[PDB]
């Protein structure tokens with residue numbers, strides 16, 4: 066698909082720019098430059114490119130209905146690509162750190178970045194951080210004179226904070242709230258009392274929906290100079306909804322999509338995560354079922370893991386999901402309908418983003 | 428100096444803002460609020476506050492020799508405190524991740540954040556990131572309508588990026604450049620050929636000088652709208668020079684100052700770090716002394732460690748530091764003079780900053 070290639074080509078632009086700058090402003094040597102090139106390829110490439118491509122699509126849809134000089138068209142499409150990449154680079158930062166936090170082995174069909182035979186966990190922390198840093202450099206280099214620079218950077222920042230906070234909810238979701246104390250050694254939860262829809266929604270809202278759906282969407286508008294022509298509240302509601310569904314697919318896939326189709330190896334069960342499956346199960350399980358689940362959740366032992374999976378299967382969880390899916394469908398279409406009022410094209414962009422998301426098998 | 432008291436009470440103001448915001452916008456629960464309040468205090472207070480206080484002292488310099496209404500005088504003093512905190516919070520981000528990376532045990536007389544009884548490394552990483560991300564929230568909230576905002580953010584990003592690049596130089600400073608390949612497992616240098624002054628200088632230039640000296644000084648000029656009235660070039664050089672010297676003291680203390688007084692347990696020898704002692708030692712040792720060093724360096728075994736220290740002691744590195752120090756004093760005063768040309772008062776700020784650093788013992 067053309068356009069996918071156009072987007073990857075701007076990646077080539079961004080990379081050369083970044084690496085040339087290391088040579089000329091940062092006294093980098095050829096081997097570290099190479100290391101940073103490979104780290105950049107591994108961590109930023111290989112995914113679905115939903116997030117960046119969404120920004121490209123939102124911008125295409127305003128362009129098609131809107132008067133610009135050809136040069137303004139080119140600048141907006143180029144900005145679109147560059148903003149998209151800022152978002153793909155922000156994902157890469159998230160995934161690098163998160164794979165460390167989650168104890169994972171595989172990303173995007175390759176070993177996690179920290180598990181690259183010649184990487185080590187300790188540079189990985191720092192490479193992850195370099196990834197975020199690159200985003201700000203791109204912003205400042207490419208958008209230096211653009212009128213959306215402030216709005217873009219300030220949103221970028223809030224979305225990024227929201228994500229960090231969500232990752233905290235995420236990373237401590239098997240703790241008892243009443244017990245969370247940096248002074249005192251942290252035993253995992255035994256009642257699972259905090260495995261509720263509400264607690265679950267809060268993790269997901271923050272750890273995922275902002276950077277995966279809100280950010281791409283508004284970015285497309287920012288570079289398009291088109292924020293005025295939509296109802297921000299509507300954009301916020303739809304991004305939170307689709308974003309939640311997205312994280313739910315991901316919880317489901319952690320357990321039931323095999324590594325070979327998925328490109329990653331599940332760890333939620335091993336990690337005692339407050340996942341949509343755990344939450345949904347604990348919401349419907351009987352006394353016998355709750356008890357076996359309590360005896361097996363949160364342990365690396367493949368036989369225990371396997372007992373949780375049998376229980377998920379027995380609990381007919383695939384079908385609660387399809388129910389959830391259908392309710393989301395209803396609500397998404399409803400929000401798309403409401404977005405047709407001000408921006409029919411944004412609306413259409415959202416439909417496309419929804420469609421892709423809806424039928425990812427990732 | 429009444430100055431320290433303004434600075435500290437501003438923290439209280441910043442902490443409350445960040446914490447209350449967490450409650451009203453991020454749906455946080457009181458336990459997590461309490462976890463972040465302690466994280467915030469633990470990783471941000473208890474330092475020597477040279478960075479933050481530099482930006483206060485620089486701004487105070489101009490208040491002294493300009494004249495302003497007390498309103499404006501207090502808007503600048505307040506801005507300088509917030510600026511100063513952004514810097515301290517940025518150190519905090521660096522120290523938390525740097526402690527995990529170095530596998531250290533103690534920070535400012537207490538366990539490293541990631542080692543606190545109920546903190547997991549996995550969550551510590553994310554705390555470290557929340558800290559960076561706090562600095563951006565501050566900037567946008569306190570400095571929204573300030574005209575230095577774009578300059579300030581831009582600079583901040585450059586300094587942070589350079590700091591990440593340098594941590595990369597540092598944490599791969601015990602590798603053979605020629606053999607730094609993500610795919611291939613990588614043993615540590617055996618020739619130590621990269622243990623040079625030029626390479627040392629470059630590590631330290633990026634990992635430390637920019638955020639320790641360049642940023643607090645320029646930040647001061649920023650909040651005082653005084654950048655125009657100094658020779659930026661001089662600032663850059665005096666910053667790079669005090670900065671190198673500053674890090675040399677760190678390296679020396681890492682080996683020679685006791686935890687009791689130091690506040691951290693040394694680990695440069697154990698981690699095979701390209702410290703100023705290893706490089707100064709390789710620059711003067713005879714063949715038998717180089718060989719003993721190579722046989723012993725980069726290893727936790729306390730005995731191997733004691734050999735290196737024995738070796739360092741025998742070579743009067745203590746001596747060499749004084750030579751270096753005395754040279755640094757020449758160069759510094761030189762640069763201070765050159766700064767009295769446009770900016771007598773800023774030049775005094777620097778001299779103050781120098782004397783603090785010069786005779787610290789941390």
Ligand SMILES: C=C(C)CCOP(=O)(O)OP(=O)(O)O
Nearest residue numbers: 111112113114273277312315
């Ligand atoms: C579920 C989330 C939020 C992280 C996984 O992101 P993706 O599945 O979209 O990762 P890519 O491989 O497409 O980058």
Ligand SMILES: C=C(C)CCOP(=O)(O)OP(=O)(O)O
Nearest residue numbers: 473474475476477635639677
């Ligand atoms: C030398 C560097 C760059 C890190 C240690 O910094 P400090 O020793 O200045 O730490 P504070 O306690 O003053 O924060």
Ligand SMILES: [Mg+2]
Nearest residue numbers: 163164167169
């Ligand atoms: Mg993960």
Ligand SMILES: [Mg+2]
Nearest residue numbers: 163166167235
């Ligand atoms: Mg995770």
Ligand SMILES: [Mg+2]
Nearest residue numbers: 315316319333
């Ligand atoms: Mg997942």
Ligand SMILES: [Mg+2]
Nearest residue numbers: 525526529531
């Ligand atoms: Mg360290």
Ligand SMILES: [Mg+2]
Nearest residue numbers: 525528529597
């Ligand atoms: Mg270090």
Ligand SMILES: [Mg+2]
Nearest residue numbers: 677678681695
């Ligand atoms: Mg040290």
